Design a protein around this ligand. Sequence first.
Ligand code: HEM
Ligand code: HEM
Ligand code: A1COK
Ligand code: A1COK
Ligand code: H4B
Ligand code: H4B
Ligand code: ZN
Lengths: 415, 415
Amino acid sequence: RFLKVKNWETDVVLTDTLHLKSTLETGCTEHICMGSIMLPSQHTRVATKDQLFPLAKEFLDQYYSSIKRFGSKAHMDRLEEVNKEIESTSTYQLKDTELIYGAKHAWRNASRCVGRIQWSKLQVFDARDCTTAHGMFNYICNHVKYATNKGNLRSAITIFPQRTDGKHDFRVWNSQLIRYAGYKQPDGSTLGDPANVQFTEICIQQGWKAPRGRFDVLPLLLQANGNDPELFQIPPELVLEVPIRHPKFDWFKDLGLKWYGLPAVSNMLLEIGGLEFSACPFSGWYMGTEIGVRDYCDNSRYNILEEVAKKMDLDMRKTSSLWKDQALVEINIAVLYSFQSDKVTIVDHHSATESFIKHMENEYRCRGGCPADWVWIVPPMSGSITPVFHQEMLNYRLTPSFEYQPDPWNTHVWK
Amino acid sequence: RFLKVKNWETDVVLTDTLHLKSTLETGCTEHICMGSIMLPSQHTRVATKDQLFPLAKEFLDQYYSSIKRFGSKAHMDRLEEVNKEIESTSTYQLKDTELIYGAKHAWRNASRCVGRIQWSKLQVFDARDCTTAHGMFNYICNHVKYATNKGNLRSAITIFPQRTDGKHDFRVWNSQLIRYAGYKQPDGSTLGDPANVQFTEICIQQGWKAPRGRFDVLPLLLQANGNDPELFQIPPELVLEVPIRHPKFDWFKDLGLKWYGLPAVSNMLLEIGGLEFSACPFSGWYMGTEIGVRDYCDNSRYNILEEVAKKMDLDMRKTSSLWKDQALVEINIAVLYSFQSDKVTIVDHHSATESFIKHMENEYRCRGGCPADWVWIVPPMSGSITPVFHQEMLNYRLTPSFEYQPDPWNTHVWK
Ligand code: HEM
Ligand code: HEM
Ligand SMILES: Cc1cc(N)nc(COc2cc(CCN3CCC[C@H](F)C3)cc(F)c2F)c1
Ligand SMILES: Cc1cc(N)nc(COc2cc(CCN3CCC[C@H](F)C3)cc(F)c2F)c1
Ligand SMILES: C[C@H](O)[C@H](O)[C@H]1CNc2nc(N)[nH]c(=O)c2N1
Ligand SMILES: C[C@H](O)[C@H](O)[C@H]1CNc2nc(N)[nH]c(=O)c2N1
Ligand SMILES: [Zn+2]
């Protein structure tokens, strides 16, 4: 009942009691493991009043347990206070203090996140007073500006008002606030970013006028209080981009690539004490592999191993010349280099995996465990030369949490 | 109840009913996933008579189901025949035909094995008539010779007699038949192979006279019918080794490395119809990463990224120069190259992962699924540029199977 995880590079052993507080299910049963299914029906996100008080209760009991007032009159009164508001309006509202707590712990509990060492250093912007798509654009712009901080990136989250009835719903329709457009061509091939070609279309549907190129920063599509979403373009001066050069190959400039400094995931759902925030964009800084490995080299993303290997003059006949591997290490040295020569915050996959282990240490010491998803923590290149390859991680789902949710244009009862 | 696995590189979907025949547990529960624990208490291996007939029954029912005689008089008679022998001796004996079947399906069901596309092409050597450590040495030598086949490697398994009482037990004490010795030094550092330093000691304990160098091929330690194990050295002429050069760097010869052609796992337990074969060494050919990535570059293995990066003249100050990644792709181009220039069978990690997907196709089509462990199927470098990174795999434990077992010197009631 008090499980043990081992590291096989260091012969280090930690004990995990934190999983006893766990609540949600994981997809796995006694007779099957779903640890590699992408979006289980568990990780995807309508709640009633009887269901709501336990969740409000359980969350408040840990929030007061964490300020050294577990069970006092401050705790009890707030328990009755929300119990009362839950009678009155069937739902309730979070204190400013409870929002910062819940927010930070959704990150802290995010088992697929390698960078959680920074979870307490998080900036919470309360956008619960927002009412229009224009209001959302203004909060989101102030977020971009703040988190970007001149490439000295800072973590932040902006929390639009919680889902209520369920049809009056705030959503950012973009996957990330900053993403390049994706355009199909005549021959079927794809200019820009193949990932977003669906979204680019709905953008031009609603009225976007695309500069049909590669690294076209998409506009924002903002849905407010259930209304139909509206297009807004972030000021270009607030979209910090990094041109990708290499510290050897002078043709790497002619490759012509660039990426945005700020990764800002916007399309997911923040759960706090049983309340659902459908729009809650959060940002940090990039790990180099997210761009150099996945973005640039996924077959169905930018797919540049073709072109890079060419310029390197590479044995591209044989599969086993390892030319793909060769051009991937070069591509990732260049992303890191380019980002660092511009003083834009980036972390290499070795630094970040080492910290996640140092992080795992503190989570097991001062918290009794740390949920972690190996499939997603291991960087997607040079896996076993990073230290997390050899660390056993127990995955389990605590709360407060971040949950996937269906895309709006599928669910949105239009016009 | 009829689950679906998706690929996210190809938008391909397969349906898995095969997991319904599954039997053993996996460590995972509804509320926690152990998918990254190395050796769960489930994967590690004493059975009685009441327990034995169901397992014999279930196995015979699939063996006859697979030769298009499900339930006939041949099936029924054999059912009564083993039921009878299970009354008489509490245990029973497998037909030559049932041994080849069970054997091949333990490989086919081995969810951590990327090369299972070859599972039906398997050569079964029946060593159940063996009685002495000398007999074991002779069967094992004939296996080495056969599977090696002049570097044109062939898959094989040799099946020593099944565990009976439990103290009369055949075991190969080596992890792999062919492994290099591991020697601690004065300063504590390790010559040879750090992994085996424990075993090298027990070898010299029992009487080995080590040529205290690096790539010293270990002797065999063979335990027969519960007796104390005995030392035998494979004839050097049967140990095919590949010197590791690079197709560029002429100092790669001066690096001075070599590896054995034949990977032959000897320390595990073959389960067939409820019967336990404690010694059952099996071999195939190497995937390049097993040597170039793990053997040569694991921190606690040969740890050569230090020395290789030097000769390349590498930015080894900064972590984020990605010099480890750089020297790992070179190291793996050299292992592959060296092995192929000697006509010794080796497979690169791209070829092998592509076949495992082609394999997964046939297992889902003509068998209804394929148990697969993502944590172990994904190669430990360049993960996301291989196609298995993007394939969802359901893990589950069928039978016949290969199981881990405790090392003998812990359990063996000595002398
Ligand atoms: C501080 C720098 C951060 C870094 C370097 C980082 C890195 C990563 C990486 C590499 C992933 C794997 C996803 C992928 O590669 O596709 C991930 C996932 C994730 N991160 Fe972090 N991240 C950071 C900050 C944050 C912040 C600020 C939040 C929320 C406030 C957060 C919450 C999450 C969540 C919810 C996931 C995905 C979990 C899932 O998909 O179920 N992270 N992150
Ligand atoms: C034919 C060429 C083969 C290749 C290229 C291959 C490759 C691999 C690899 C890369 C692993 C992961 C283990 C690690 O990297 O540490 C593995 C595991 C395994 N293979 Fe295969 N293998 C082959 C043949 C075989 C054969 C002939 C058998 C048995 C008859 C077998 C049964 C297994 C088992 C039982 C495991 C480990 C499962 C576990 O640890 O629970 N494989 N193999
Ligand atoms: C703040 C931050 C910083 C940083 N450095 N990185 C990240 C990555 O956060 C992610 C990323 C994803 C990607 C899932 N993938 C994307 C391609 C499409 C594929 F279908 C799914 C999903 C999430 F839910 C996240 F939270 C976030
Ligand atoms: C026939 C064949 C061909 C091939 N090409 N490869 C293999 C690899 O088969 C393995 C490998 C392992 C290694 C586990 N690791 C080893 C380092 C120590 C660490 F503790 C555990 C365990 C098994 F049970 C296996 F079956 C086999
Ligand atoms: C098939 C598998 O579920 C899928 O490819 C996962 C594997 N691990 C991952 N890990 C990260 N960080 N990001 C990803 O998108 C994925 N994809
Ligand atoms: C911690 C984790 O359980 C362990 O490192 C696993 C990960 N996946 C692996 N995959 C393979 N092929 N071989 C291994 O030894 C391991 N080790
Ligand atoms: Zn699981």
